[PDB]
């Protein structure tokens, strides 16, 4: 009987500790999950913005190349015309 | 050629679903019966035409709806 | 508000839709009868000699050929509509779909069954 | 439910048989696929001792049995035992006679033909089903993710295979099937545990080593740093209680067991790890669908449940792949049953309802019908 | 258990207390006259088949607003009885499509707010501002004042 | 718009189909003319997989298709595919039924008769247009420049032809049609890329090589000096990122690919370059209109968009031509769509409104009506 | 005493299961936390890349307009020489 009472007591104490720690961990996980969702949305927006900027930069580079080549050709033509 | 295919199909229709109405030597009773069966055929063709018209109208409306939803895709 | 009233409103809309479909079907039948009265003139060929019967049969044969050409055109247009519908449905499944997989549920909690099986049937619902 | 007829989505697997009716979320009955005859003599009379305990019953009497899996590497090596397993699955775990239900088995890629033909012959002659269909285990796992492209690495317990798919068109020339899987990891763990003194030999103790592997092992993000850390500190040593007491302490055996996946030279296999056979499977594909496959890498199967594998694999592939492409690894939480969920979805489709191998068709062409149009 | 609870709602609320007694006959220890937070959490975590907390949160998100799992009596009914599944396949989709075709009177493929009022008048139901505002909020997912066909299907997804 | 009736200015081309209503500035829908059947097996059920993706849809699924152009060199080699392309163009890219719109196709000079007759027969029987007219692709490009004289070099993607015109009177004996065009340049570029290690073989990778050619290649002003410079410095090596990473570096392949135009001996063709067939086409003309043709040389077509070609060609012709004449090369910035802009202008004219081939005329004389007065 | 011992055994079993579930929740939480760390790093990288591309685009616009003005001046010069 003495042994059984000891075992009952210590088991009950340990069980209470376990349930409380489990609930606390669950709460922490909930908060961390919400933060992760927010950061994921921010990452998606950053990706789309970077894509837009890259497209614009590529277009500008192409147009600049075209215009520069035109300038070079007309430069040489002007010298010969002089 | 698919245009040759459609010409062939139309020509076969003109030579398959059409009967030879050379019933001049038939009796007056039998000529009346043939006229009655022709009237039945005319009614059947008109009923098929009306059903086709209603199906075409419903298809056009549903195609307009699907075009609008395609505009709603993006 | 609550949801039972919304369910009642939805069921009323469904019943109104069924009534409208029935009314449109009746209207289609009435218009088919009107078309039969209009296009299909009463044709009585009683007492005519063979020659008039042959002439009228030949004329009806020509008219039937014209109607068959018209029906062929309309059926070709219907096949065109079917092709368009198939293409549009394919495009919708390609674009509006992707993540449009069905949402199935078979993991219902069989709590009431266990309660009714191990504690009698005091529950007057299930 | 009621009228109508539901399909049975069975999934033989190798290590766990997963089954259930089509249209649900999870398999109804999941139980190990082992058939164990008793090995001792037996003195009590009238105890009602059977001659073979199958399924989950032999995981409770395993102390006096000799468990033996009927499926070695995808292929089936012992047809009588497999028939017994199927009979148990149909009659006792689901309690539905097969005479009134279509079945949808699953099979690994690149398996011997005779295995598939014998499977269909059994299903049509012994159990006498109305119609059965065999599907590749990776396409289903791609169904479950709700994608339509992507390269799926289905590291089961028998065999690890890597099927790339684009826009619904499978690429048959880019399937890389490797025979390292969970069972070899269990054997290697059982072999390296002997370095501390714990010897597991009996076929029953293989189950204990499997439990140790499931509960403790994890995949290291960087192998050399972990080997150095575990050799200096003692923050990794996790203990575990055997089925009789005498707790054991696992040191750097924790991340060395599942490391075999990325370095198959540990168990003497020549081939490259699961981190490099995926990249090779991608590079065999055409040059214009490599970006989509890079972005939609899918993980499935049981063995891909190790804590920390979805990061190690991404790091490795990012090291191998060109720097511009984005590498993304889809690791759904329902990884273990992904194949069966996909099987349920496929069996629930209306478009699929005419692809079953109807019994009259089998009667006209014999078991070789499976290789024909009804694949 | 939506329909069974709805039908038993023809009787008093005290029947709920009797339910608690039955629940206590399983897991005795309840005293508040209802399936409280202790009872609900314990049964959702112990009954042998454990619904995932993700599944519980997703099912609760139909009615639960705070995201915790604690509600009042009628809201508890609406939140919890809706969890179980009764509907099957949501009838036939082509029937819904034909009925929606007959719905949109102006033939544009959209159900506007005016069309919604016309449908309410066709049903003959009492003119109630709260129900009209609820329909306006619900049917209009994209905040344009109108209703589409897929929006109608979502509205009727699971409704006989 | 409203009442009335607008004409459809289609322009089959070879490589890009350009179409749009008459009276605008630019074609409404421009998309490659390729029809690609899928080549793999396909395992997903109900994915809605079609049997042939045409137009711009097959440039996105090209990873699992076998694209094949229906027009080889001006002429049409696969009539079913061309009919499919036309059907797509009318119904999905413009969404106007052809029963209510005249059409104005375009055709290269010196093409087989049967091609033109079959084209008109298709347009009148299958699509059932009210009236169609076929015009030579160079006269339109001369319309778009707003000139009335000049010798136009229309270097398309299929065939390069050089039609001289004076005061509106075309000179039929001075048309020099050469079959080197953009497609042969793509093949030659794909063949010389192998000298660095990059191998493109699949018909899908021909599109990647075409993109490389468009974005990087340029025509050298002087060939030998560029060959010497690229062999000493490294200021020319421009890099390019494939559809999956693994950037490539193009060295002196940049100006060697389009140099084939001026030296057709590179791809084994005997004839002289586009710099000398223009001078030969001029010299066949009468002695009194050579000055005007020298001063009004017009460039058109896609392949004449290489950066630096309007100077190389002028230098070459000035070398060939007598020293007194002034050589001027008209190179409008809207070169690619010059033929279609000219087609729109021609279809919008009131004087032209009675030149269409009306359907009753076709019914009376058959498809051979096109060679008759209604040209 | 035997009855108390039996109840103690039941308590021990329940405590065992509670510890299992608590450790599982702890595992989930720590894994998600490390994932959030990684995702935050990636989002920061995306921000940096997008800002870089924007700067490139502005520079390209300026160069474009400069070269265009040069080309127009050269056009006027060529017309005069003609
Ligand atoms: N949680 C886990 N952690 C680590 N390994 C696991 C886990 N669950 C299962 N496994 C391993 O995966 C195997 C089960 O794989 P499974 O997907 O059932 O194979 P099959 O494809 O034959 O169904 C087991 O043998 C075990 O070794
Ligand atoms: N910007 C460009 N630079 C260089 N080559 C080009 C460019 N655009 C198009 N091309 C070449 O021209 C071809 C398109 O020519 P196009 O005028 O469309 O032919 P068609 O006369 O059949 O319409 C393409 O195949 C490509 O090889
Ligand atoms: Ca709440
Ligand atoms: Ca409306
Ligand atoms: Ca709306
Ligand atoms: Mg498996
Ligand atoms: Mg052209």
Q: Go through chain F and tell me how many residues it has.
A: 375
Q: Which candidate, D209, D164, D187, places its Cα nearest to that of D72?
A: D187
Separation in Å, CA G4 to CA A15, A18, D152, E118, E133: 17, 22, 54, 72, 62
How many other CB atoms are there within 10 angstroms of residue D116's CB atom?
19
- How many degrees, rounded to 5, is the angle at CA D51 between CA D47 and CA D55? 105
Q: Atom 9 (ligand 2): residue with closest C-alpha?
A: F302
Query: Residue F329's CB: how many other CB atoms inside 10 A?
Result: 21
**Are 3 or more Cβ–Cβ pairs between G and B shorter than 8 Å?**
no
Ligand 4 centroid to Cα of residue B69, in Å, is 13
Q: DSSP class of residue F6?
A: P
Q: Is E110 annotated as ligand-binding?
A: yes
B chain contacts of residue F121, beta-carbon cutoff 8 Å: 3
State residue F290 phi and psi, 5-degree precision.
-75, -30
Query: Which residues in chain C touch residue E26, judged by CB atoms under 8 angstroms apart?
Result: 115
Query: Which CATH number does E2-83 carry?
Result: 1.10.238
* G38–D307 C-beta distance less than 8 A: no
Contact list, G27 vs chain D (CB under 8 Å): 307
E2 is in an annotated binding site: no
Distance CA B31, CA B54 (A): 35
Is residue E70 part of an annotated ligand binding site?
Answer: yes
Mutate to test the pocket of ligand 2, among F14, F15, F331 (most ligand atoms within 8 A of CB): F15
Is F12:F340 a contact under the CB 8 Å cutoff?
Answer: no
Question: With a 6 A CB cut-off, is F74 part of the ligand 2 pocket?
Answer: no
Residue labelled with tokens 């684009």: D166
CA D104 from centroid of its chain's CA atoms: 16
Under a CB-based contact definition with an 8 Å cutoff, are residues D27 and D7 in contact? no
Nearest CA to ligand 1 atom 7: D214
D18 is written with which tokens?
Answer: 């997963």
End-to-end alpha carbon distance in chain C: 28
Chain C from 6 to 35: CB within 8 A of any B CB:
28, 31-32, 35
Site to probe by mutation for ligand 1, drawn from D157, D208, D260 as the one with most ligand atoms within 8 Å of Cβ, is D157
Main-chain dihedrals φ then ψ at residue C107, nearest 5 degrees: -110, 35
Tokens, residue D73: 């590497």
Known binding residue D328? Answer is no
CA of F35 to the centre of ligand 7 (A): 19
Q: Classify strands F17-19 and D357-358 as parallel, antiparallel or unpaired.
A: unpaired
Taking alpha carbons only, the member of A62, D73, F357 closest to residue G57 is A62
The pocket around ligand 1, CB under 6 angstroms, is made up of D 13-16, 156-158, 182, 186, 210, 213-214, 301-303, 305-306, 336
* Encoded tokens for D164: 């790339």
Give nearest CA residue, ligand 1 atom 4. D214
Chain B residues with at least one Cβ partner in E under 8 Å? 58, 61-62, 64-65, 68-69, 72
Annotated ligand binding at E148? The verdict is: no
| Alpha carbon distance E15, E7 (integer Å) | 12
> Which sign, positive or negative, has the C-alpha torsion B65, B69, B70, B71?
positive
Q: Residue D316: name the closest of D261, D251, D240 by CA.
A: D261
In sequence order, which residues have a C-beta less than 8 Å from that of residue F100 and are 6 or more positions away? F5, F130
Altogether, the residues listed in chain G come to a count of 82
* Buried/exposed D259-282: b ≥16 CB within 10 Å, e otherwise: bbbbebebeeeeebbbbbbbbebb
Residues of A in contact with F310 (CB under 8 A): 73
Euclidean distance between CA atoms C11 and F7, whole angstroms:
52
Q: Which two tokens stand for residue G26?
A: 């702890």
Whose tokens are 């097969």? That residue is D98
Cited resolution, angstroms = 5.8
D121-140 residues touching F, CB cutoff 8 A:
136, 139
- Separation of alpha carbons C119 and E27, rounded Å: 13
Query: Would you list the domain boundaries of chain E?
Result: 2-83, 93-153
Q: How many CA atoms lie within 13 A of F83 on its CB side?
A: 16
Backbone Cα Rg of chain G: 36
CA of F137 to the centre of ligand 7 (A): 6
CA distance G71 to chain D (A): 36
The DSSP string of F15-67 is S-EEE-BTTSSS-SEEE---EEEE-S----SSS---S-EEGGGGGTSGGGEEE
D21, D24, D345: residue with CB nearest C101: D345
Cβ-Cβ pairs closer than 8 A, A with F, add up to 8
Domain interval for residue B39: 2-71
Residues 6+ apart with CB under 8 A from F363: none
Atom of ligand 1 nearest to the CA of D16: 18
Same fold: E2-83 with E93-153: yes
**Which phi and psi angles does D258 have, rounded to 5°?**
-80, -5
Distance E73 CA to ligand 3 centre (A): 12
Edge to edge, what strands does the sheet with F53-54 contain?
A: F53-54, F35-38, F65-68
Q: How far apart are CA B47 and CA B41, in angstroms?
A: 10
Q: What's the CA-to-centroid distance between D72 and ligand 7, angstroms? A: 64
- The sheet with strand F103-107 has its strands ordered as F103-107, F131-136, F357-358
Closest C-alpha among E41, E118, E126 to residue E80: E41
Q: Phi-psi region for residue C60, left (φ > 0), alpha (ψ -120 to 50) or beta? A: alpha
User: Considering Cα of F191, then F194, then F198, then F201, what sign does the dihedral take?
Assistant: positive
The C-alpha atoms of residue D302 and residue D334 are separated, in whole angstroms, by 10
D-chain CB neighbours of G31 within 8 Å are 307-308
Q: Is F244 on the interface with D (CB under 8 A)?
A: yes
Ligand 2 near F156 CB (within 6 A)? yes
| Chains contacting chain F through 3 or more C-beta pairs under 8 A | A, B, C, D
Separation CA F104–CA F374 (nearest Å): 13
Q: Is D302 annotated as a binding residue?
A: yes
Nearest to residue D304, comparing CAs of D154, D120, D186, D195? D154
Q: Which two tokens stand for residue G55?
A: 């700067």
Vertex F24 angle, CA F19 and F27, to 5°:
25
CA D100-D102-D103 angle, 5° bins:
130
| H or E stretch covering D121 | helix D113-125
Mention every residue, 6+ apart, whose C-beta is less than 8 A from residue F165: F138, F139, F142, F148, F149, F150, F151, F152, F171
Number of Cβ pairs closer than 8 Å across C and F?
Answer: 8
Sign of the Cα pseudo-torsion (C33, C37, C38, C44, in order): positive
CA–CA separation, C52 and C48 (whole Å): 6
Contact C67 B49 (CB under 8 A): yes
* Parallel/antiparallel/unpaired status of strands D53-54 and D35-38: antiparallel
Which two tokens mark F266? 């590179």
CATH number of the domain at B24, please: 1.20.5.350
The DSSP string of D130-172 is SEEEEEEHHHHHHHHTT-SSEEEEEE-SS-EEEEEEETTEE-G
Phi/psi at A70 (5° precision): -60, -45
SS (H, E, C) G65-78: HHHHHHHHHHHHHH
Which of F48, F91, F92 minimises the CB distance to C90? F48
- Six-digit token string for C38: 């209009």
Residues of B with Cβ-Cβ distance to F79 under 8 angstroms: 1
Cβ-contact D8, D22 below 8 angstroms: yes
Longest dimension (CA), chain C: 93
Instruction: Judge D/F contact: 3 or more CB pairs < 8 A.
Output: yes
DSSP calls for F174-242: G-EEE---HHHHHHHHHHHGGGTT----STTHHHHHHHHHHHH----SSHHHHHHHHTT--SS-EEEEE
Residue C119 CB neighbour total at 10 angstroms: 12
Please give the number of the atom of ligand 1 that sits closest to the Cα of D13: 22
Element (H, E) at D240: strand D238-242
Nearest residue by C-alpha to atom 9 in ligand 1: D302
Proximal ligand: closest to the CA of D18? 1
Q: Give the closest residue to C91 by CA, choosing from E111, F266, F49.
A: F49
Count of structural domains within chain B: 1
CA distance F369 to F363: 9
Fold of E93-153: Recoverin; domain 1 (1.10.238)
Angle (CA) D57 D59 D60, round 5°: 75
E68: closest CA of chain C, how far (Å): 20
């Amino acid at each position: 009987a003495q042994k059984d009472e000891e075992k009952m007591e210590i088991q009950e104490i340990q069980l209470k500790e376990a349930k409380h720690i489990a609930e606390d961990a669950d709460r922490k996980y909930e908060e961390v999950a919400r933060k992760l969702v927010i950061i994921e949305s921010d990452l998606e927006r950053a990706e789309e913005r970077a894509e837009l900027s890259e497209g614009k930069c590529a277009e500008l580079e192409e147009e600049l190349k075209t215009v520069t080549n035109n300038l070079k050709s007309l430069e040489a033509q002007a010298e010969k015309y002089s | 050629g698919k245009r040759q295919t459609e010409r062939e199909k139309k020509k076969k229709i003109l030579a398959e679903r059409r009967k030879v109405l050379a019933i001049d030597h038939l009796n007056e009773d039998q000529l009346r019966e043939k006229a009655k069966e022709l009237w039945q055929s005319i009614y059947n063709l008109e009923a098929e035409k009306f059903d086709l018209q209603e199906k075409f109208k419903q298809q056009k409306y549903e195609i307009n709806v699907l075009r609008n939803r395609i505009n709603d895709n993006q | 508000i609550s949801a039972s009233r919304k369910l009642q409103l939805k069921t009323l809309m469904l019943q109104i839709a069924k009534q409208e479909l029935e009314r449109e079907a009746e209207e289609r039948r009435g218009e088919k009868g009107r078309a039969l009265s209009t296009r299909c003139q009463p044709l009585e060929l009683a007492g005519l000699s063979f020659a008039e019967l042959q002439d009228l049969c030949r004329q009806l044969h020509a008219r039937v050929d014209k109607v068959d050409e018209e029906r062929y055109d309309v059926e070709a247009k219907v096949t065109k509509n079917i092709t368009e519908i198939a293409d549009l449905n394919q495009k919708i499944f390609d674009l509006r779909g992707k993540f449009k997989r069905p949402t199935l549920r078979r993991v219902r909690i069989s709590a009431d069954a266990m309660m009714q099986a191990l504690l009698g049937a005091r529950a007057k619902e299930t | 439910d009621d009228e109508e007829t539901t399909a049975l989505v069975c999934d033989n697997g190798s290590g766990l048989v997963k089954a259930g009716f089509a249209g649900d979320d999870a398999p109804r009955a999941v139980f190990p696929s082992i058939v164990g005859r008793p090995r001792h003599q037996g003195v009590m009379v009238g105890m009602g001792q059977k001659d073979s305990y199958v399924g989950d019953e032999a995981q409770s009497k395993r102390g006096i049995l000799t468990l033996k899996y009927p499926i070695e590497h995808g292929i089936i090596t012992n047809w009588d035992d497999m028939e017994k397993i199927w009979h148990h699955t149909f009659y006792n775990e689901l309690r539905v006679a097969p005479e009134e239900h279509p079945t949808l088995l699953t099979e690994a890629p690149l398996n011997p033909k005779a295995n598939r033909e014998k499977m269909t012959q059994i299903m049509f002659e012994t159990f006498n089903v109305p119609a059965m269909y065999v599907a590749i285990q990776a396409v289903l796992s791609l169904y479950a993710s709700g994608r339509t492209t992507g390269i799926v690495l289905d590291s089961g317990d028998g065999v690890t295979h890597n099927v790339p798919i684009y826009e619904g068109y499978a690429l048959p020339h880019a399937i890389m099937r490797l025979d390292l899987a969970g069972r070899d990891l269990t054997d290697y763990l059982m072999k390296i545990l002997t370095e501390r003194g714990y010897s597991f030999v009996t076929t029953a103790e293989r189950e204990i080593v499997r439990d140790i592997k499931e509960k403790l092992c994890y995949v290291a993000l960087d192998f050399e740093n972990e080997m150095a850390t575990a050799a200096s500190s003692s923050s990794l040593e996790k203990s575990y209680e055997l089925p009789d007491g005498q707790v054991i302490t696992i040191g750097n055996e924790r991340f060395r067991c599942p490391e075999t996946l990325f370095q198959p030279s540990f168990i003497g296999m020549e081939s490259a790890g699961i981190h490099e056979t995926t990249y090779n499977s991608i590079m065999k594909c055409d040059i214009d669908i490599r970006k989509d496959l890079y972005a939609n890498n899918v993980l499935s199967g049981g063995t891909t449940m190790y804590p920390g594998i979805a990061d190690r694999m991404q790091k490795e592939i990012t090291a191998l792949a060109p720097s511009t492409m984005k590498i993304k690894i889809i690791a759904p939480p329902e990884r273990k049953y992904s194949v069966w969920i996909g099987g349920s979805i496929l069996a629930s489709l209306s478009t699929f309802q005419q692809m079953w191998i109807s019994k009259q068709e089998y009667d006209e062409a014999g078991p070789s019908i499976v290789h024909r149009k009804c694949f | 258990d939506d329909i069974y609870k709805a039908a038993v709602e023809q009787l008093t609320e005290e029947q709920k207390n009797e339910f608690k007694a039955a629940f206590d006959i399983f897991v005795l220890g309840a005293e508040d006259g209802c399936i409280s937070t202790k009872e609900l959490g314990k049964v959702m975590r112990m009954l042998g088949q454990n619904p995932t907390p993700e599944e519980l949160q997703e099912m609760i998100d139909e009615v639960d607003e705070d995201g915790s799992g604690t509600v009042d009596f009628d809201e508890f009914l609406v939140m919890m009885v809706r969890c179980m599944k009764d509907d099957s396949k949501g009838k036939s989709e082509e029937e819904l499509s034909d009925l929606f075709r007959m719905f949109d009177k102006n033939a544009d493929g959209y159900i506007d707010l005016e069309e919604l009022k016309i449908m309410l008048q066709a049903t003959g139901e009492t003119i109630t501002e709260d129900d009209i505002e609820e329909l306006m909020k619900d049917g209009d997912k994209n905040n344009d004042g109108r209703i589409d066909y897929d929006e109608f299907l979502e509205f009727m997804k699971g409704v006989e």
